[model samples]
Target chain A: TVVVTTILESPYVMMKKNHEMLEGNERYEGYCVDLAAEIAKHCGFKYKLTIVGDGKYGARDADTKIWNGMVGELVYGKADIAIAPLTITLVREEVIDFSKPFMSLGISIMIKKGTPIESAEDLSKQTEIAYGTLDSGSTKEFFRRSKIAVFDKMWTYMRSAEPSVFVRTTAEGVARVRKSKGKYAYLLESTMNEYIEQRKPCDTMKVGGNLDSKGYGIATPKGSSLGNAVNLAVLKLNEQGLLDKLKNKWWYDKGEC
Target chain B: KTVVVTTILESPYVMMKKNHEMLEGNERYEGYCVDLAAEIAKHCGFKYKLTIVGDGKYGARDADTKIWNGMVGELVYGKADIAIAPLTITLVREEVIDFSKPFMSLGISIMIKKGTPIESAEDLSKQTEIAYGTLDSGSTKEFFRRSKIAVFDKMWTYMRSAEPSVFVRTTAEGVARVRKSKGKYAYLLESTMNEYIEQRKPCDTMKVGGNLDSKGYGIATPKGSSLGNAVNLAVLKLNEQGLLDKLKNKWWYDKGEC
Candidate 1:
């Protein structure tokens, strides 16, 4: 049996409310759960889905120099595979092997339905509307480490803006936007933004296309024997339109946006 | 029959050649629109004469006289069979003329000195520390003048009545004014021209913010003109064949200064 690591991010992976009555993998139901089942079936492997205990998306701590999250689980050889909405960034690729990307997304701005903001450039120029990304995530790192001039300037503003604009989680960031009324905007992955935009209340909207494009890939521990089979399974699933089907099931068929 | 193609003298659209003194007729001018006109004529099976619009405007109605000016006026008055310029597709203009699918897409964008604190229309709209304006004539100016969008309408009020007259007679004047303003002025213009200028010498100016609004330019004809359909089809064919993209690359990037 393979141990698959995941996180508690919404839509991607979530604990079903009736978990106490269920056993093993049945305890979770989300895009990731459905995806893991498909991958395991194709690869002919039985798998156990587990959440990252620390609830992080995997980033290296500068002081301790330790990797955390699903990435850490794989690095420590505690998990055989990781299936989640984990981004395929250059830094992470160095420590782990990733299957071809299963989904594509980019940074997007989320605002209350009637906010004047339409693009990142719009957000960068205004002071009246405060904006920021989740305190820790690829979306936040994208702006912090961006080379594009406009994004760089925005990073400067976000880094030093008083009263601390950053939020600890995507949910907190979304909450901040709703609480700020029309005065605050949140920056996050387009997939998450779109998913949240479709949820109840429907008072928020994803504006413009996206700032930069990236994708999420199924990952395995470095040099794991299952890497190649998992990679081929992803490609087959993609060509058969199963991946697209799952996305629609989770993001659009139920979409309100 | 030779169709009179009325165009403007906008740089990189239609301009008198450096050797125009010795050149004759259409041979004396060249630009993106100039080349485009040739392709359209060849494809549509029409003979054409290239002529400059008598009034150097992109076409706006005179409020006091209720008459169109520039290329639109030329077409409405039967002086030109077609207009090949960076004429924007707007509801006001669409009513009086027929426009093909957009030959190019662009939008109103902000141009600022590299270190300007302002990054978008919202920032500009909220303060008087920095003055902003658009060309005295053309779609960009007309957009602000006729905008119903709150921010754009407010900007029009400020630009139309600014003490020193924020309007500039030409884009060059606007760029020069921005360069000299020392973070005190911002220029609003089409993103296409803004991007081109950003790649040229003294590249201190940068386009900030996404465009305030999206629009495109079209090849225009007098309403119900026989040539409209033929020209429209030709534009779409060229777009499908990637000639339009190739032409843009030739004029914009191949000639980039910096």
Candidate 2:
């Protein structure tokens, strides 16, 4: 049986309505779910679902700042495969195996609609503005792990900020940006930021350049039998139009607004 | 005890015998993989049954559907005990199986016709007028896909931004594109692939830059298997004797029958 491991995140993994009533694997559901099911069906494997114990979905935790979430799950053997918004990073790649990215996007920043931030350099030059990101996620972690001069400076500002400006989720960070005027900016996935920009009364705009370029990938233990099959499943989903269809269904059609 | 082994029929791996009477599997052949397998068998104390993989690509998830081939599939399906080919130790493949310490070291390198402006992976990103890509389902694809720094990142930018036709699907396809495209096209591949091509009798393409990164070929087995320990030790022994290098030059460079 496929003991699939994953975390809760929008447009990637989201609980269906009434999932709270379900128990065990039945409670799991989204893009990776359907994709994994197709793979199991094709490859002839029965599967079960389990979420990682740590709520942080793969970021350098600021307090403990360990690489938790999917990174930890695969390394520590908590899951066989991880189907979350897990990004493909060099360090993580060294420890785990990732399929070619099924969905691709870059790391970007979001700010209240009229903020002066235009480029990373522009943001770095400002002292009065305090920006932050999701506590344990790819965007925040990218800046934290980066060695580039500008990004290093950005990390210093992020680590030393008063009230420490980090949020538990991208949505929470965006909410803060919307409510806090020019004082706070949120760093997050470009796809989500752009999606938020198109919504009504959209006060948030993606600012500066993407913090870095990378892609979200499905992950597996460093040595799992399903690596190739699962990777191929993602590409197949992409080719058969199911991947794009799922993205639109989750991101636009099912939005609460 | 013929330890069963199956590999892909890659150039410089296994080839046909000179005599027409011989069958497909019995053909005359010599390549790095061919010799390494023999040497491994000798060191590990086993007779061997040599065979080829079901498909040609190194190891990949199938494109139209999902599957694996070459050494990866051999180990996964229990068809072979080990693969000592010029196979790269990619992160994806490493998840399903284990790799021995690298026996031969090389880097992902660029190949161009005599005077292309591009020199390294970094140069490819800046050359908007020029276009380049890797074999669709090989190690080069994974390298750029996972890389976050230096020439690797630049190479990824070039590949992602290139027009649809820019990326070639096979090594031969890349060589063909470079030969005919009037310098508009370039190729990225392993240094071994480039060096193998370079040693051909009528060599035309040249490796432009020193490698952008260092990597090596390894002995691979299914993960968490007891065989990994013995295989790893055998690899270290082979490396120390220099028989591995000898076999590379004997088959890959100096000793090819063709």
Candidate 3:
């Protein structure tokens, strides 16, 4: 039996509304839950779902330099696999292997309706609107490492801006955008951007195209035997159109946008 | 003072109208850049004179003479106040001048005549039967020369040593070569130009695969020019107001033949 570690990020993985009575995997439902089932079905492995206790997507601490959250669980061998909206980044790839991306996403701009920002370059040139990405995520890392001059310039501004432009979570970034009333723009993955665009209030808009393109993958510890099987299963699901169907069911068919 | 705008005579970006003899100055041209220049000038509250670059080249540095040429040269030599053309914003140019936020985005793309065996860069790189080249002394060529990615670097090596020299001086000449080469040559250029050609008559050429890189075209000005901030703001305003999209549709699609 495999223990699949995940986080409670909406549409990807979440606790079912009536979880008090459900047993084992029955207590969870969302894209990742359905995906884990499909993957297990294809790979011929049974697994139990568990949420990360610290509630982080994952990041390495600066001074202690220890991996935390879902990443930590996999690094410490507390979980056999991680199936969530875990981004596939180079640093994470060094510690864990990732299946072929199940979804393609990129860093996108989320602005309260009527904001003047049209592109990241625009944000970099002005201080009227404060913008930032979620701390400890690929989006933040992208800015930190980007060689593109515009992105590099923006990173310099964001890295040194006062009052801390970076936020602790995607939700915190989104909430800041909403509450700032057009003064703040949240830079996050396009998937989350589109999801929130379709949510109620609908005051947030994903402006311009994505800044850079990357993807999210299901992760497994380095040297795990299941990596190949999970990768093949993901590709098979993609070719069969099951991944698209699942995305539509969660992001759009169930969307208010 | 009127802004002395330096633009190029490239098609779909800036071109002479059929009634050119009856019009003068900015009125003599009509295309994407023409419309954009007007919008920007209107927003920035400046009168402007549109003059085509004396040479048709986009911009390049002479390795032997260390002199800039094309629209970039005009700005450096103080012959123009700003360049509102399809000039790509490259790092080399950014060191000498400033650019507004990109008004358009594009990337290096492959174009092949119909029924060509090539489909992707990898496909071309793996075989020696087909030949490929980019515009000589342009950004596309520069990318191949400077690229470090394995596939791109391999392509660069192939292009550099290929007998008979694959480079072309003009886009029109490159397109013509692809058409007549009988599936033997592929032209690599910006996706915007590739897509535009794909829509033109005959339509025998098609852009294949995704872009090799992502970059944008920006309005350029000489470094420390007083016009920089206002022009930048004007471009942003036009973008936010959707005028840029509208202008693109007007020029590219309103009269599209294919």
Q: Please, what are the lDDT tens digits per residue for candidate 2 over residues B1-258? A: 566776666667665555735655433555667777777777777777776666766787776866677678778777777776777765567778777656676677888876877777667776677778888877778767766565567768667776675666567788888878778788888888787776665466778887765555667877776666667667656644446656677767685333
How much is A180 displaced in model 1, in angstroms? 41
- lDDT for model 3 comes to 0.85
- Sliding window of 10 residues with minimal summed lDDT for model 3 chain A: A232-241
lDDT of 2 by residue, A1-257 (tens): 66777766655566778898888656666766776677677667887777778766675444874668767777777777887777765556666777656665667878887788887777788887788778767677667766667778999998988888789876688788888878787778887787777665667788766654445677888878788677656655543446666777766875543
DockQ of candidate model 3: 0.03
For residue A61, model 2's alpha carbon misses the true position, in angstroms, by 8.0
CAPRI grade of model 3: incorrect
Q: What is the per-residue lDDT of model 1 for residues B1-258, given as tens digits with 9 covering 90 to 100?
A: 899999988767787899999998888899899999999999999989999999777888888998998899999999999999988876567778877756787778999989999988988998999999998877788777766667777888999999899998777889999999999999999998898788888989999999776556889999989997678668756754457767887777888887
**DockQ, in order, for the candidates?**
0.02, 0.01, 0.03
Chain B TM-score (each prediction, in order): 0.95, 0.86, 0.97
**Regarding TM-score, does 1 or 2 come out ahead?**
1
lDDT of 3 by residue, B146-195 (tens): 77667888999999998898999888889999999999999999998898
Which of the two candidates, 2 or 3, achieves a greater lDDT against the reference?
3
Residue-wise lDDT of candidate 1 within A75-177, one digit each (tens)?
9888889898888765676788776567777789999989999888898888999989875467777887776667888999999998888987788888988
Best by TM-score: 3
Give every collision pair in model 2.
Answer: A61-A65, A222-B95, A223-B95, A223-B96, A224-B95, B7-B53, B16-B28, B17-B27, B17-B28
The collision pairs in model 3 are none
Ranking by DockQ: 3, 1, 2
